[PDB]
């Protein structure tokens, strides 16, 4: 009744360590069937340990293992036993190959998000601590991506320890770890108490923005929008706005492109006065940037960022840039400007629109490229 039907499962288990990689992959794909044939207790005790201890295969097999383990909770007995999936994934998170360890981090996040608070405290915090203190850089890179899972349910002592650990990771001697810390900074900060958001998270952000490598600084600057959306206007102006202003005139066009993308979002956060004194000159410089990509990014938003502005300030500062952009050399710049320039008819008001926007509208109407025309003609 049982032996004959499950003989094929035994064959799959045997093929788990077959010479041919295709059969190993197939057995990995049928891990749930093998676990059901085994039973929960012994999926926990034979199968998961086998996956943990036999991990020297090709990257395809390891990636498949990470994928399968990410959705393997029911086959180990449910949430109460979800923690037994952590060890193997942890090992997979230390693999150098990017796809494997990134999938392992994603699966760790899935399992943790399904885990319940007592189990998080009992196992996931220790997992995060081990990864953060790992002697291999891949482990610390992976650790940067699981802090937000463990932080919310941790006790206050563990929360302080985790803030210190993330600060250390931001300070890491290996640049890739610092890049991962910058990448996950905003998302971890979303889980931190207001009190510590404005002291510890700010320290991490400012350390990253002063990092010696270009890539770390670029990644840190990318998080300005998220951090500002998480902060009070006071601290936003004090901490993030100067970074935006400084990097708007960085020699790297990619950093300036990032800043141009985030300016309008930061405008709401800082308020009208700081936007007038601080954001407007940076936006003007980005609109008149040396690189066409930055000019495109800024032109796509002149309307949004004039809508919040005083029409006096808009007319004085933004319109000259809009004029030059209308006669810009790049067809893509002209297209981006035209796709949003019409939206300023109501914001400026008939009196100002007539003196300033009329000629640009007609010029864009008679453009040499159907892109610009269509962009201005469709939204009439």
């Amino acid at each position: 009744m049982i032996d004959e039907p499950l003989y094929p499962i035994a064959v799959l288990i045997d093929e788990l360590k077959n010479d041919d990689i295709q059969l190993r992959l197939n057995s990995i794909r049928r891990l749930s069937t093998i676990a059901r044939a085994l039973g929960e207790e012994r999926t926990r005790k034979e199968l998961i340990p086998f996956l943990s201890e036999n991990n020297d295969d090709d990257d395809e097999v390891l990636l498949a293992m990470a994928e399968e383990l990410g959705v393997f909770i029911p086959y180990v007995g449910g949430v109460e036993y979800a923690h037994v999936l952590l060890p193997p994934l942890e090992t997979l998170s230390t693999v150098e190959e990017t796809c494997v360890r990134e999938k392992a981090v994603e699966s760790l996040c899935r399992v943790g998000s399904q885990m319940r608070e007592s189990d998080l405290v009992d196992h996931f915090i220790s997992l995060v601590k081990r990864l953060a203190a790992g002697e291999w850089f891949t482990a610390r890179v992976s650790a940067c991506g699981v802090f937000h899972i463990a932080y919310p349910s941790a006790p206050d002592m563990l929360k302080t320890e985790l803030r210190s650990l993330y600060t250390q990771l931001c300070q890491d001697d290996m640049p890739m770890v610092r890049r991962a810390a910058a990448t996950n900074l905003g998302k971890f900060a979303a889980t931190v108490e207001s009190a510590h958001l404005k002291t510890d998270v700010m320290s991490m952000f400012e350390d990253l923005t002063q990092d010696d490598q270009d890539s770390v600084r670029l990644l840190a600057v990318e998080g300005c929008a998220a951090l500002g959306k998480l902060l009070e206007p006071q601290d936003c102006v004090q901490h993030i706005l100067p970074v935006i202003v400084n990097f708007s005139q960085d020699k790297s066009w990619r950093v300036r492109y990032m800043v141009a993308n985030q300016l309008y979002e930061l405008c709401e956060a800082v308020g009208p006065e700081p936007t007038r004194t601080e954001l407007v000159p940076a936006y003007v410089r980005l609109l008149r940037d040396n690189e066409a990509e930055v000019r495109i990014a800024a032109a796509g938003k002149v309307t949004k960022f004039c809508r919040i502005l005083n029409p006096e300030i808009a007319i004085q500062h933004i319109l000259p840039c809009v004029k030059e952009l209308s006669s810009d050399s790049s067809q893509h710049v002209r297209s981006a400007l035209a796709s949003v320039i019409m939206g300023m008819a109501p914001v400026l008001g008939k009196d100002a629109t007539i003196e300033h926007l009329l000629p640009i509208f007609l010029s864009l109407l008679k453009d040499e490229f159907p892109d610009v025309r269509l962009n201005i003609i469709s939204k009439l």
């Binding site: 150098e96 203190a133 002697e135 291999w136 850089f137 891949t138 210190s164 600060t167 250390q168 300070q171 890491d172 001697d173 290996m174 640049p175 890739m176 890539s215 990619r254």
Partner: protein
């Protein structure tokens, strides 16, 4: 130490439970308890002594915290052991159950003592002699303790963190680190850690700004000479290049570009060709080759140089079986596309410039078209030959010369290149409706009149060439006619002056007669006479003697008699006296026969003159 000092510690008793409790009630300092306990004379066996836990418990009791007890114990210990020796003893004690907790506490206090002195992890690397482990560093019993201190220092000094790879590099150079790792991966006990440290080394090189150029020598790729693609260091270098490109998007340089930095085309291309032949490097080589071709196309490199670089100038007779021929043909096609006639470099031009003439290429094509795996490439090469002939508006006789068919001789009709000649003839005639050429034009250019006539006559006797030879003989007659050949000149050209004897059975003479009849058939002002040519060539006596001789042979009797009558008429018109005629006649006949020929001659002489 001294004699009889040993045989008094026999008598001197162990303190015991009561003595410990009395000391504790009197607050005897732990150092004192240590000295009276027998732990002065243990040295590196201190932690293995049964009385060590007793002293540890006492010192813990006297203190308030675990840290204070550990600090007092360490102070008692940091004045009796060196840092290395104490660390080694602690590490050994940590692997044992009874002493694990106390050893860990002592290590914690020890690391705090080092940290308060602000000895960096580099300083403790020096203290542990990890400078001196060399190839065995990964097996050092103090490496784990150093790693623990490194983690603690990184925790307490986030602004000044370090790594094992960085310290190893600082004290061993990139070279010592590389060879340490190489040695460590030969022992299975240290292989995994060595691989991890190799990855760490790549990350460190990226951190220190090293470019792929520097890591080329750092991986010792130069040490592989011309066989670098086979090295695992090459795979590491490719991984490094991917990392670097991700870090430096605008300074992104491909693998082939850096290989060009370290190799010029002349040596790099052969490396790619050889690697392409090897299955294990087949893929990588292919990709590099692909990139190389694109890069030549961007540089507009001549297909002749591409031919040389791919080693095709070495192929010789095996050119069509060379695996790189298809790639070179494709590159040449890409190079010439959108170029004009004067600016393009064609396959035939490269072949000739490389000293592989048309006949050699054609022979290689003929051989390769029989082999199924080279048939397609052979047909492409044949198309290249025909395109080359057509572009310069070669006539069929030009192509006949290009195939060296003038050097083949008798068997030219059976040569495999004769098919190419006739194929081009058909093509050219179809493409020139007003200027059609004949199949004999090439042969006439390549061979002179007598040689060509003899060749055709010989081929006519072979059944496989009889039809073609007959057609070509007629064509040759027409060719002579179109060229205004005087029959008497042609007689000389055919070397028919050699002998009057048997000329009436000479096949070459028959061909000449065919031409003479054709020449007379198209209305010359003066109908050409056979007897005139014979007399001019051999003289009256020789011709008359030959006619007398030939009249006795049934196969030539009729023609000989006709010619003799014509000769008599010729003598009559030139007013030859009967005495001269008799003198001529009796060089080849008797008195009576000569008499009757003389009388006939006199009769028709009288008829003409009298």
């Amino acid at each position: 130490v001294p004699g009889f000092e040993k045989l008094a510690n026999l008598l001197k008793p162990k303190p015991g439970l009561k003595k410990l409790l009395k000391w504790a009630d009197a607050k005897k300092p732990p150092e004192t308890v240590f000295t009276r306990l027998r732990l002065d004379k243990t040295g590196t066996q201190l932690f293995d002594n049964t009385d060590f836990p007793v002293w540890a418990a006492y010192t813990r009791s006297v203190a308030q915290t675990d840290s204070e007890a550990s600090a007092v114990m360490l102070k008692t210990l940091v004045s009796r052991y060196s840092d290395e020796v104490l660390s080694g003893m602690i590490a050994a004690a940590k692997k044992s159950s009874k002493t694990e907790s106390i050893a860990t506490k002592l290590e914690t206090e020890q690391m705090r003592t080092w940290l308060a002195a602000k000895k960096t992890p580099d300083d403790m690397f020096l203290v542990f002699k990890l400078n001196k482990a060399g190839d065995d560093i990964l097996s050092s019993p103090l490496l784990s303790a150093w790693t623990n201190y490194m983690k603690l220092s990184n925790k307490e000094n986030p602004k000044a963190q370090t790594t094992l790879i960085a310290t190893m590099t600082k004290h061993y150079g990139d070279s010592g680190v590389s060879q340490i790792l190489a040695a460590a991966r030969k022992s299975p006990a240290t292989q995994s850690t060595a691989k991890r440290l190799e990855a760490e080394q790549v990350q460190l090189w990226l951190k220190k700004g090293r470019t792929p150029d520097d890591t080329f020598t750092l991986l010792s790729l130069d040490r592989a000479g011309d066989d670098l693609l086979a090295s695992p260091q090459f795979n590491t270098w490719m991984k490094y290049i991917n990392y670097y490109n991700k870090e430096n998007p605008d300074e992104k340089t491909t693998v082939l570009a850096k290989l060009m930095t370290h190799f010029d085309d002349e040596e790099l291309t052969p490396i790619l060709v050889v690697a392409r032949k090897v299955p294990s490097t087949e893929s990588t080589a292919a990709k590099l080759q692909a990139e190389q071709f694109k890069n030549w196309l961007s540089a507009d490199k001549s297909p002749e140089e591409a031919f040389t670089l791919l080693q095709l100038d070495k192929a010789g007779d095996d050119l069509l079986t060379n695996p790189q021929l298809t790639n070179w043909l494709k590159y040449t096609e890409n190079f010439n596309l959108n170029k004009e006639i004067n600016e393009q470099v064609t396959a035939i031009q490269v072949f000739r410039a490389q000293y592989v003439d048309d006949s050699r290429i054609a022979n290689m094509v003929i051989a390769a078209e029989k082999v199924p795996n080279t048939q397609a490439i052979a047909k492409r090469v044949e198309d290249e030959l025909f395109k080359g002939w057509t572009v310069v508006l070669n006539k069929p006789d030009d192509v006949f010369i290009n195939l060296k068919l003038e050097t083949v001789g008798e068997n030219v009709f059976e040569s495999p290149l004769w098919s190419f000649y006739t194929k081009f003839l058909e093509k050219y005639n179809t493409a020139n409706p007003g200027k059609e050429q004949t199949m004999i034009s090439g042969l006439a250019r390549g061979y002179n009149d007598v040689t060509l006539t003899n060749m055709l006559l010989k081929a006519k006797e072979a059944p496989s060439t009889k039809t073609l030879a007959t057609k070509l003989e007629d064509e040759l007659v027409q060719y002579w006619l179109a060229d205004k050949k005087l029959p008497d000149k042609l007689f000389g050209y055919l070397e028919l002056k050699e002998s009057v004897d048997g000329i009436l059975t000479n096949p070459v003479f028959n061909v000449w007669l065919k031409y003479l009849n054709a020449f007379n058939d198209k209305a010359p002002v003066k109908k050409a006479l056979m007897i005139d040519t014979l007399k001019s060539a051999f003289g009256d006596v020789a011709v008359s003697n030959m006619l007398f001789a030939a009249k006795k042979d049934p196969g030539t009797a009729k023609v000989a008699a006709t010619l003799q009558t014509a000769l008599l008429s010729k003598w009559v018109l030139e007013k030859k006296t009967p005495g001269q005629v008799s003198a001529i006649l009796k060089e080849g006949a008797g008195a009576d026969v000569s008499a009757k020929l003389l009388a006939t001659y006199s009769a028709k002489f009288k008829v003409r003159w009298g």
